[PDB]
Paper text:
The V/A [name] from the thermophilic eubacterium [name] (Tth) is one of the best characterized rotary ATPases. The a-subunit is connected to the A3B3 stator in the V1 domain by two peripheral EG stalks which form a peripheral stator apparatus (A3B3E2G2a1). The proton motive force generated by respiratory complexes drives proton translocation through a proton pathway made up of both the a-subunit and the c12 ring.
The position of the central rotor DF-subunit in the three different states corresponding to each state is in good agreement with the 120° steps taken during the catalytic cycle of V1. Similar densities were also assigned as ADP in the map of state2 and state3 in the nucleotide binding sites, albeit the densities were less obvious in state3. This distortion is due to the asymmetric arrangement of the two EG stalks relative to the three-fold pseudo symmetry in V1, and is likely contributing to the instability of state3 in the V/A-[name].
Author numbering:
A (entry chain N): 1 to 303, 323 to 651
B (entry chain M): 3 to 322
C (entry chain Y), D (entry chain X), E (entry chain W): 5 to 80
The structure:
Amino acid sequence: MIAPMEKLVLAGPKGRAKELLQSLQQAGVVHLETLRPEALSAYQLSPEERAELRRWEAVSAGAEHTLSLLGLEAEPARPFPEGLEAAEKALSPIQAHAEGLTRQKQELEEELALAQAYLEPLERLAALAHGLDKSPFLRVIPFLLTEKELPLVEEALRKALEDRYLLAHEAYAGGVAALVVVHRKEVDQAKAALSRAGVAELRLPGALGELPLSEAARRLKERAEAAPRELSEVRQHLAKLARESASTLQSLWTRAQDEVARLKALEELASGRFGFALLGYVPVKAKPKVEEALARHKESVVYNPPWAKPFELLVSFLNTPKYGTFDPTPVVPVFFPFWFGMIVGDIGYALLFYLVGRWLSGYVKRNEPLVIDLFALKLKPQVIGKLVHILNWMVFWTVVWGVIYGEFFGTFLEHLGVFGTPEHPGLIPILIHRIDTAKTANLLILLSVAFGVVLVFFGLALRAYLGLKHRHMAHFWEGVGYLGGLVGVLALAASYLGNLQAGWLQGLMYLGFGVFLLAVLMSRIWLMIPEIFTQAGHILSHIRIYAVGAAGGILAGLLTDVGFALAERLGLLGVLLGLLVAGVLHLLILLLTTLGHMLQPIRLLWVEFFTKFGFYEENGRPYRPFKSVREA
Amino acid sequence: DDFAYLNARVRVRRGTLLKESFFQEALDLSFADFLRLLSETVYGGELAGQGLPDVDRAVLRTQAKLVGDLPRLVTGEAREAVRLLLLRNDLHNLQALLRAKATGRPFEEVLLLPGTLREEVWRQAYEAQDPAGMAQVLAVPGHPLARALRAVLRETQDLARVEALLAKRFFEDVAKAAKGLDQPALRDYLALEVDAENLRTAFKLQGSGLAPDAFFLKGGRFVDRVRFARLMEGDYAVLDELSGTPFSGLSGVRDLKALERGLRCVLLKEAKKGVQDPLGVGLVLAYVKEREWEAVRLRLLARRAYFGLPRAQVEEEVVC
Amino acid sequence: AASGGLDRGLIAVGMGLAVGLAALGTGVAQARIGAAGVGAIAEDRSNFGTALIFLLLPETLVIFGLLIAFILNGRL
Amino acid sequence: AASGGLDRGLIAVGMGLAVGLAALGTGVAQARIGAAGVGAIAEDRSNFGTALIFLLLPETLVIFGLLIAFILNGRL
Amino acid sequence: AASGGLDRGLIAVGMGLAVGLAALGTGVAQARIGAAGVGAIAEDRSNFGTALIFLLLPETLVIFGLLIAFILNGRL
């Protein structure tokens, strides 16, 4: 137990090292570093201190362990004090009760199990045996054999014994409990004969077995009978202990735990001051003032909605400095339109996604493991479930928004906004699709295609800021220079992009535009220039992902159309209810698969994320993957 | 191809066992009786008369004729893989030759297990004086260990250190080499060996707790340099933190002998996975391991029987 | 229906090649990658995403077929 | 029934092509994974529900065939 | 239904094709998946109800053929 103060633990980036350092130091807080290389070599904890820590571990662990056997738990909170002695003492009686009873319960189950099982064979043998292991004049060898065994066992026995033995059996079920009876002196041959056959003298293993067959049989009735009842008591006490003491167990546990970490924190700083993070021991007087602010970069242990919620989490990754260009934070608002807009469905697609959203944001007990959804109950990881309760609401809003993207989308089908097509039909709106037919369809084709290009433009802007402002000249040279090519790209594109609408606002413009491209790739020299080919490949990919996100999207709406509306023959009316045979079915299948579509937004994003357009990852590289960053 | 043949050849081969009950008898079998029991079994086919050196010799030959035959077959992907296993023990043998070579100890007393390279390679290597020359000999037919030995030899010609740094380096070569297949099971068992070797080495070296990595062989998958280090610092709590890891029978163990037993069981449980593994190397691999496991018990029990040594003396160690 | 236009036929043929080839390709792509996985499922319910993540990239191909089919429609 | 024009003639074929082809794709996809799958059951009956779910996605090919076979007949 | 016009010859050929192609795929599927299993079975007798269910999945392909063929002929 150190000199008075509550230890505080923080770790973070280089920027937070400083902000943090200042915040602890001025008040009258002690033993602070990084603030010198190791004057905590003159704060090396005593062996005694290490010992106290050691004790705390026994207690900490003991609580956990005991909680386990008991069959209940506790979970980590915010540290608190009690005194070690109180906690140890607290831990001890209960651990002793729970532990004793847990064993007893186990034994009881076993007693029951064996005794019932053994009850029948011992009884069969006993009934036959009319007492003979009682006798030494006759010796009896019980053994069980199936009737599979009986002619063979009989031949082996017969061969050794002749007729100087009694082989009798009364059945046990699927075989017969058997006795070979022999005279004294015949015993040795008698065991060997059964053994040769592969059978052998059978009774229960250990002390109970030795007892007369008759006696063993009695015991088996008794143990089998006794044990469940007895089990109830042992189990009851245990259950009772868990029930009452759980809070307590946890409080000791938490208390102890907070010490185990706390003590360790002291030891390491003592020892060798770490680096970009920040240690200290902070007094009772000092302790709140430093903690309230935190500047969003570290990790501690003390002692409208659609736009904000995941967006709030990207804010934390903005704050870390470790390089010379802007931190990676744009992603959540880049995601959102498409996230909502993936669902751009019709009658069965977008407009049915609702059922799920109120179930998940709300609570649904309909499910075999899901009960109250706030409580994350799952056949899959529970822990994982709790965190994205926040998400259930943001997803519910997504479900609401996707429904909206059903009526704007449905403009170019039915509705009103840019087209005039009936504001609402009479039978099944979206009987068939305007979009299935080419002109409407075509506009949607061109629509995705542009969007992949847009994500590329954002990336190279970032690229030039990166190499510029990080002074990665090779990269700077790359982000500006690569843009040199583009005018010529537009040139060629136009004669196919409007076909008749364009193609000739530019031409052999490419011949000089291509030169502009390569100029500074060549200025750095770069003994590996051809490699720019791959930068071009991404563009086609960006397009493809959006295109698929759309097309698979469209396909989704069209299954409600061949699943409820029109398809069969040339397309007919009664297909409506012929398909209803199918109709209930298509809905659920559809639901499962569209989840696959939303991983494509992210697939698109993944193209951009590791392509060094304001990023720290580059197949690793000190910083946590982006994988972990975006999820909630 | 030819693991159609191999698993099948193995399927027949797996029968010549000396059952668990063999060993149970042996606890209760005197040496003569132990010997009698052996002579009636497949080891008995290499046993002439009675006597321990003969039992052990019988073991070598028994393993040899059913497994040792196999390295000459090297042709399948699998055969090469099997070659790696044998190479490792043999790598020991090679070390035995190297060390023998260094101390004026003659070539002649270093038995080798069935070798990929023949007697004459070993002889030449021994006979090829310079540490480079010895290493160069082993390379003549090809031997990733030759080159590795050389790789280590490039910096100095200090035999013992070369052997030590080589063993780490070789198991490092092996890590790539085993990866260079695929036929996972050998790879898996080996991975457990990496972890096991780390545990025992840290164990051997514990209380030293120096710069751990010189003794930490890499390829830990549930073990790491620090866990190794901690154990080497004397912190036994590592095994208690290496629980729920694949190695559960080591939990709370504080002796190397029992440690080796638990490890053997864990790894054995892994070896046992192969029983009808196709090109997947498990059926042959497991089979080699069976012969191994049998051999361990036989030799142990042979002595037990020989000296009349307790049942309790063998009791931990002839079961897993 | 009935006697198809000479034009309708040229596109109608090619309509099939896109759906069949991509569909076949996706199933097989998923199958080998799918084959490697199984010990992990057992081991870690949480890690499960990796084998799964693997499957998603091939998924683009079939969808591509639908897009070209879409432009053709009303000529077919 | 009876005679058919060029659309009908083209579709009549494809109703068959569809049913045969999907089955073939399903089988190949199944062969690699299916071979892989079994050891896990032996070990774990518990995971078996997961396994029961596990095999399923390539199998989708067959079902598409029945709807399309249905659709073709009637332009046939 | 027996001899007739232009449509019918086309369905009659393809009716067979439906059956033949699916049969090859099912067989291939059984060969790899089937091969792994027996050792697992050797150990796990336990699996036997499961074993009746496990093998069962590629085989659906054949059933798919009988409806399309029957409905085609043996129903036309």
